[PDB]
């Protein structure tokens, strides 16, 4: 009859094109809830993320908007695939919800961390993160929020990043968490943490809590330098400058051989190279931390290096949208609506 139809998953309603069936809840990636479904026209598993009245507020609207524009304009093997977008309401008047349909991967990295990988697997997964990140950066998009739960893998060892809901807790770069002002290598810190976590097999800086992060961090890495302290917001400085001061530990002591798989047949795929790469990523002072190009160029990673993966044409944004500009509840709704209407096409 009407194209759409309605399913209750516990308290939530998914109103979606009829092609999408047997929905199952799969998670709550940041700013919406997500379901797996069977797509009967493609004959294919997909994931459907619902953004409920995304225009409700300043925060959400910006994010939904960013996520909408970039999902369209960014296509790459290592960034999650866009399949469809829609709303079931028939007008700007009546408009409430946005649905984004995506490929369904098999797992998120949190699972991979738990398991014993060999060097080609870790390296290759990290290579994939980095190539994805480089694609985003080439367009001046900085992700700022990479973590295990927004990076997904398949049983054929492919890896894709999702989210640019935040794209413009110890996973975030210190420069971010200290309102410091930041460049692209903000994302390298995150990769450092995730790499470390893949090697350790669990949480890198054990809590308990979102700010017992920091302390375990400086206890582990060492307190950062004076110049670095200088750069801080005078007020936030004196918090940081107060802490007991620590030397930190070498990377040999933080990531000893025992934690690594056997060295591989291949020269560059060894504990000492991984540890080297780590110690250039997992670095608190961003201006001493390596870039995505150097990390791609690094011996531990560069074995996979493929220029046609790593050097694709940038996504292009209208930069008409630079979207820092405060808008109002009302205008957001219009902006997102046009963005959705423009995207809509497949049913």
């Amino acid at each position: 009859d009407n194209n759409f139809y309605s399913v209750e998953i516990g308290d939530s309603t998914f109103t979606v094109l009829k092609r999408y069936q047997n929905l199952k809840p799969i998670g709550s990636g940041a700013q919406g809830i997500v379901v797996a479904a069977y797509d009967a026209i493609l004959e294919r598993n997909v994931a459907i993320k619902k953004l409920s009245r995304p225009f409700q507020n300043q925060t959400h609207a910006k994010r939904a908007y960013r996520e909408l524009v970039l999902m369209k304009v960014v296509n790459h093997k290592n960034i999650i695939g866009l399949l469809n977008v829609f709303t079931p309401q028939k007008s700007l008047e009546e408009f409430q919800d946005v649905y984004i349909v995506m490929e369904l991967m098999d797992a998120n990295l949190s699972q991979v961390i738990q398991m014993e990988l060999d060097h080609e697997r870790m390296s290759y997964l990290l290579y994939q993160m980095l190539v994805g990140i480089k694609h985003l950066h080439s367009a001046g998009i900085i992700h700022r929020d990479l973590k295990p739960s927004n990076i997904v893998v398949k049983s054929d060892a492919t890896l894709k990043i999702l989210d640019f809901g935040l794209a413009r807790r110890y996973y975030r770069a210190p420069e971010v968490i200290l309102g410091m002002g930041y460049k692209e290598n903000v994302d390298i810190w995150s990769v450092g943490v995730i790499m470390g976590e893949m090697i350790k097999g669990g949480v890198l800086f054990p809590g308990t809590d979102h700010i017992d992060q920091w302390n375990k961090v400086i206890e582990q890495l060492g307190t950062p330098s004076p110049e670095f302290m200088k750069k801080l917001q005078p007020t936030v400085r004196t918090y940081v400058e107060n802490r007991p001061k620590y030397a930190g530990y070498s990377f040999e002591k933080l990531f000893p051989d025992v934690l690594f798989p056997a060295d591989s047949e291949h020269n560059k795929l060894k504990a000492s190279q991984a540890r080297d790469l780590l110690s250039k990523m997992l670095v608190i002072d961003a201006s001493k931390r390596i870039s995505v190009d150097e990390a791609l160029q690094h011996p531990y990673i560069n074995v996979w290096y493929d220029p046609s993966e790593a050097e694709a044409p940038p996504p292009k944004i209208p930069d008409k949208q630079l979207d820092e500009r405060e808008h109002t509840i009302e205008e957001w709704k219009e902006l997102i609506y046009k963005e959705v209407m423009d995207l809509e096409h497949h049913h």
């Binding site: 797992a107 398949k154 054929d156 060892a157 291949h266 074995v303």
Partner: peptide, 11 residues
Amino acid sequence: RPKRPTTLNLF
């Protein structure tokens, strides 16, 4: 030199 991995066990 090394082949890209093509399997990853997620069971």
